[PDB]
Amino acid sequence: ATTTLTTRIPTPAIYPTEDTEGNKLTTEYGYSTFIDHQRITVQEMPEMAPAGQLPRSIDVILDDDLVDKTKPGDRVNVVGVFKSLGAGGMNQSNLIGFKTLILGN
Amino acid sequence: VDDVTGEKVREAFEQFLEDFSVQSTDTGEVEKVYRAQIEFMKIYDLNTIYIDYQHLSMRENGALAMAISEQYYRFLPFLQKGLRRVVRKYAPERVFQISFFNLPTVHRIRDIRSEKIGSLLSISGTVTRTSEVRPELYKASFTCDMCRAIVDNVEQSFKYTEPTFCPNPSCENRAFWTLNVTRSRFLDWQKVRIQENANEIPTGSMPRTLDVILRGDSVERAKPGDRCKFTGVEIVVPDVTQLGLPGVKPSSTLDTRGISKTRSLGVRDLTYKISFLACHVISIGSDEINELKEMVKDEHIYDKLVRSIAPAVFGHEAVKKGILLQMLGGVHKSTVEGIKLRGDINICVVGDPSTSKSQFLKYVVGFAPRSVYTSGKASSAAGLTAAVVRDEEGGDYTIEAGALMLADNGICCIDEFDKMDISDQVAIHEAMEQQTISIAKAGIHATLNARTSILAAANPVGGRYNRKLSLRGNLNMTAPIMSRFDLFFVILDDCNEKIDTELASHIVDLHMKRDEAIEPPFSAEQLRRYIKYARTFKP
Amino acid sequence: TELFPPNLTRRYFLYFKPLSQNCARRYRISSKPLSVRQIKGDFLGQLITVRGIITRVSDVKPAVEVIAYTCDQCGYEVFQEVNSRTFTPLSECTSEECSQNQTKGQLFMSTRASKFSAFQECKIQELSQQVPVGHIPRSLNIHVNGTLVRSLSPGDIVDVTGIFLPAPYTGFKALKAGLLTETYLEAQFVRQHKKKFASFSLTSDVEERVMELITSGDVYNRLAKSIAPEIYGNLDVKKALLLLLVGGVDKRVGDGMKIRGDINVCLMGDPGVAKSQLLKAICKISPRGVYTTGKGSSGVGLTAAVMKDPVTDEMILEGGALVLADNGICCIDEFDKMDESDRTAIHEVMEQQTISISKAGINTTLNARTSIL
Amino acid sequence: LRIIWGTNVSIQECTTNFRNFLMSFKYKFRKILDERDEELYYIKQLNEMRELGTSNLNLDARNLLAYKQTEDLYHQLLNYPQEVISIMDQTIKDCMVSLIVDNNLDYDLDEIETKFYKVRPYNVGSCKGMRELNPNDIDKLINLKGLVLRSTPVIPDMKVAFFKCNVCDHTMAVEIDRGVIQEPARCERIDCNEPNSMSLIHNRCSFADKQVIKLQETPDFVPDGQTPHSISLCVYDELVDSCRAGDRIEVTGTFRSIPIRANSRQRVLKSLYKTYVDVVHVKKVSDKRLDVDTSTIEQELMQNKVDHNEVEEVRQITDQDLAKIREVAAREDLYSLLARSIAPSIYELEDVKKGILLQLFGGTNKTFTKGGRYRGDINILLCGDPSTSKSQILQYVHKITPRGVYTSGKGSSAVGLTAYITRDVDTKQLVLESGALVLSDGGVCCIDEFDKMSDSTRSVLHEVMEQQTISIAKAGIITTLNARSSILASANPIGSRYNPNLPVTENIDLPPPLLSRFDLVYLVLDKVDEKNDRELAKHLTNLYLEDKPEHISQDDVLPVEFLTMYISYAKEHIHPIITEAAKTELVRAYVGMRKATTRQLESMIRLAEAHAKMKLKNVVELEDVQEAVRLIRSAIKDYAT
Amino acid sequence: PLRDLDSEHVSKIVRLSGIIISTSVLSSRATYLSIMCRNCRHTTSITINNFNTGNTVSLPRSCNCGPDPYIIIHESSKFIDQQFLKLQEIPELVPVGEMPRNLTMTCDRYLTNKVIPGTRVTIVGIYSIYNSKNGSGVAIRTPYIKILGIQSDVETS
Ligand SMILES: Nc1ncnc2c1ncn2[C@@H]1O[C@H](COP(=O)(O)OP(=O)(O)O)[C@@H](O)[C@H]1O
Ligand SMILES: Nc1ncnc2c1ncn2[C@@H]1O[C@H](COP(=O)(O)OP(=O)(O)O)[C@@H](O)[C@H]1O
Ligand SMILES: Nc1ncnc2c1ncn2[C@@H]1O[C@H](COP(=O)(O)OP(=O)(O)O)[C@@H](O)[C@H]1O
């Protein structure tokens, strides 16, 4: 869900513990490739806030790059796409609506 | 084997219930009463018959009793029918309860051993809680969801859901049923919590507790906060929380041999607790009126009581009067408005340390049956006032017998009173500004009854009594809680050689084995029962 | 035939150690001692060196790698390899004699034929001087197997060399974006920059390092001046700090009595004649040295906490400074700005080697064995 | 040649080798073991057991290590105990029967044919507790030295299961095999079959007793870094209620491992195994520390008979020891011999040592058959200068006394002196743990920095100091519980050092009443001089003349191992009656103080009767009060000020 | 007043007043969603106008391609904000013996963020019934109000 902006058809592929022919396998950890995932939650800046009210906050997901350049308590501007992903309620069974977040670009 | 032997014991036990019939005639030879008790029980349908076990042991040279008491739960189905068919022929909507009592020994529950499971056993201790009396399913109708066929013959203790046959064999699945709530028997059921006797705990062990359960007309015969004695069945009950304990846990499985080509493997963990099931209860621990009348007709008994309300204490007639008077009430409902009054009497005992003021509290708690004792430092409001157990074990909530809800209609010995905090003394004074007590947690609000006297022992700010100060300053307890005391007793000590040699003699003379140095005019053998005659006098 | 596998007959545990920079520059990479921040994730798979404080360890306990099962009706053993944190019992007999058979008779585990390994784990927190500006010393999880297991003890600085690997965990289902992994380091070899005194045997390189120190003579004054030479003079103080380290002799009476073989010292004075620099200098030169301060946490900080141990379902006592240090120096500063609850812990520890507690779930008598400076 | 799988054990070869030892051992360890009369050393102990019914064979394992022909076995039972002890169960029965058939005998046969015999091997080597027990040590003999903090209720565990059949009037039973109950689906077909209908009936089954115990473990050495471990261990039938909270113990058994279920829902098991000890023997006593009060523990001395176990509770002594004890008691200077040998490294202070000795004896304990109780104790305080025995005395008491928690300062408060309620994380339930004084229901509770304990905490001892009981009313518990402890305290004055220009009652900074409710108060001021401190300095430095003080036998003093055998006799076996003639010298000594309160009188009788436990006198005599009162007056230097 | 609410007139319009305690989060609900079958490669669209548990709509059970075949094409779908409010009877006038009671209250589109917690209001609403995953009685439902408009004292404090 977080690698393309368009809702690509899901592909729940299965981690291969056996070959197509049926043989055993072992894992070449570090010929495999990895990427950092992080989410950071941003709440409204308290001096612009209409004071007295509660804080309100939303979840930002960062790919490999920007992971190193946020820390809690700093004033931060983000830009991204406010995706509304999953299918809560209308699929599966039951209310609370869709999971809303920003893809931080 | 005992599909054979059980009938032989039924024929044996029913014979004990037949070859004996009431004698004692002219106080001569004796022969057991039970038919006369059944002919009494005829009137009431209570079906709650009591059997003395000592009368059972002499027949068959004990070889019946030593068998039955060991094998009990396997013979109990045969003894109960061993009653029915006697009743069916000396006598013409039926359930029974049967008890054996007056067993030869008491086993302290620390010496409960699994070698006794299912056997009869004798137990005693302190009841710490009771619980809401509830229906137990017993015999109930079960109806098939597939057809109107029903069954009433029951499997009931556990496994209570699945009779194996449907009165028409064909079903698209035969094994499973639904219950009915309408056509069922039920019996009243209760759980009570019992605690080890503080006179017999091990060194450094805590007062062990165990769960004991009641059925039938024995229900509502336990009372919190007091010594009780029991007899009944060493039951065992499944317990889950023993997971994570050391040692292997036995797991059952259904075999796999001789069935072929047809937790899906079929497995279970059978880990158990040892509760107890009790059939008999008593609240352990003529010529009387000829003594009660005999004392009140005499002129001095008041002065005898003053010098016998605490025999070992030397002098201190003042406090002796106070405590004797504290064991006696005043008319609380003495109003026209329909609000009651603080009819009971409160006392505080004060003085420099090494006064025997603390001994009185031990004597009282040794003597006054509705009394209890607290160190008053080691305490909390939630232990004086009743706590609550929060809706646990699938039942509803239950109230926990706090030490000051207990000692209704009597004395609480609050030793070292001043070392209590502001919190619990105010909890007391809110329970003295009203006789009632109120509790809130979890939205469950309860107002308890209370009506109590407090006996408080207190100590000056510096222990030494300042002769030159008011009691408010010396004693350092705030005026509202210093109010609502009918009297304060104050003691001050110094060398008075004419007494000190008599006191020193009294202490050392006490250290000769159980000697008469503290012999009263008369003893508790009449004093407590006389006090009950005094209570119900209402002058 | 079907046979016991050679991994189940494996007499021994095998480990690796890297090559030091000397061998990298000689003949002209392989082991930079990385920061826990510097690890940048995508090193998964690699053999890496990391250094930092071992803040917390579990106790060693067995963790199974293979389960051995016994089948009577076959007589064949069944061996199940255990790889994840959990397993399910292979109760249905897989044997080659029951497979082509009607009855599939049962089996029972053998708790000594089951190949274990000694399992231990620790946190390393970042080494503070390597933290960036404004940032926090974050932590990494290390797993240990076999003979290495006791080489890590809390409150010490180490190089860990080992292989850095994923573990299957992600959060709690909703707080997820697919195929996340936890990560851990499987420890292979250890070296530690302040060494354990208990290992001290003499071999071809250490005796000459002692002998060349002796032969110049005046060793006692040479070492006093060599303690904290970055502060002026006052040798009598620094000369006594060398005795604090060597400490004298522990005496046991052979008759149920013990008297402290250790030195306890105060550095009373006015401002400007440096104190914390001497305290800090002796914290570096002392293995197991520790540094403390007057106020804040020091009640628990000088005491055993009690903790529900994260990795396994038991409580543990967690040692404050006087217990995180032992057989070594505890340094106290701003001293009189402590309080009675701190002193009445300290006052017992100078007098004797032990502490005693009797509040809540704690009733122990606890070994201190610390020098207070 | 026959051999067990995975194993080096031959049944018959070990069988004959054990018999060869069992019919020929005679203290060869004294000859062989190191540089250290009798005969048939075990045959006397076997022909001892058969008339007593005590089925247990307690075995000193090191008999085998020294002996010529069973070094081949010591390293087997140590490493294969579950199997090697299963051999011993059989060999000893056959080795009992060899003592039948060689004897013209009565009918011992008709039961020992059927009954069962067992071994409890305990005398094994030392180990660093839990910590050195790497997985190579799984399923081996082990021992632990330590103490108990709590014990669970007795647990029912299945040994024969029972099956009730919903039809057709036949039940079934099955014996448990290695943790499973293989329940038959088939209805015992030959009667008839129904596929699945059979029940399992709880109350028909046969159960073991099981119990679980929590051990605070205390090694002879611990590595720098360590902290106390609460091991959890299990004990089976014939050991249940053997040992309990506050006991100091050597225990032996098999180190084990077991999985844990992750949850009550499904059979997924944690791979990081749990570990415990299966107890096989517990050594309830030692030679170095005295014996638990026989009056207190009277409830369990008969329970050991009623439960049929001889796991010992009290030190055995032979006539050759009691004969020596009585020949020692006759000497004129026993009153100072003990007071020296109680602390051979502590100089002078013999007023202090002697009253402490009279604490350890207790004195007399008495009751009125329902209504009252009194006990022999003295509660002690030490005051005056630093740099003195005070802290070391509290250790020697602690290391002799079988029970007691060395509480200290502000680090010890009410919730942990009396009992507290806590979550047992290993099962996640509320459970009650005995506090420090409750664990000390006996012996000594040794308290230090007594005045730096808070105003709130001191209020518990203010009841306990003579009433010897604590009474509770907090959530979950309402009880009064026993706290039979004697109490001993170290204190220091107001300010520092000492200051004779202020009255002691002020100088101590302890309130007048609590100070009075101590039975003896010691003033231990230094008052320096030559020809004392020089003699002290020589004494101390002789401890550094020889780097372990083996020459401390100089200045002759009792072996501690005899002194504890004396006290644990006198304590156990004499109930000294305060004679009616002793009053006349006693009351004047009290009144002379009055020209102070009954606690002195109530102390003098409890102190003077201890001075009759010493010298083993059934009755108090007019002399023994005289030394007791002088001790009270001189302990506070009453002549000076 | 809430004290006079009854099972009488369930799903009529109701006028009532109180204090708003809290205002939760602007949860996101659909109003247009476009949907493709992951096996049939076949597209539809669904709209919902007004209903915004046991009600409204769900993705169609099937369009073989079996159950739950449908992917929501988020990047060609339109959504709306709704909010959860709680109103309680004004503490100035409630039983002396117990706490006030309150009602779950919900609102949609432009009606969101009009109100601040602690303002005094009159609500016009549909008193309506829903099922709560309790843990309440043997068979029961929970009341709620769908706000269909709102007004206030002109500005509180
Ligand atoms: N008149 C008396 N009768 C009996 N015992 C007394 C008397 N006066 C003092 N005592 C002694 O006082 C002790 C009881 O303790 P107590 O003086 O009540 O403590 P506190 O003064 O703290 O309440 C007993 O051991 C008893 O020997
Ligand atoms: N005699 C000295 N030689 C070298 N540096 C000194 C000396 N005295 C002080 N300093 C400097 O002053 C600082 C010492 O501060 P310090 O006096 O220890 O604080 P405190 O007042 O807590 O003791 C150090 O940074 C050190 O560099
Ligand atoms: N008279 C003495 N005899 C033997 N040892 C002594 C004597 N005086 C002091 N010591 C030694 O001094 C140490 C005692 O410390 P201690 O004085 O107990 O601390 P505190 O001052 O708190 O009591 C012990 O090691 C003890 O051996």
Ligand SMILES: [Zn+2]
């Ligand atoms: Zn049917």
Ligand SMILES: [Zn+2]
């Ligand atoms: Zn098999």
Ligand SMILES: [Zn+2]
């Ligand atoms: Zn059948």
Ligand SMILES: [Zn+2]
């Ligand atoms: Zn489709």
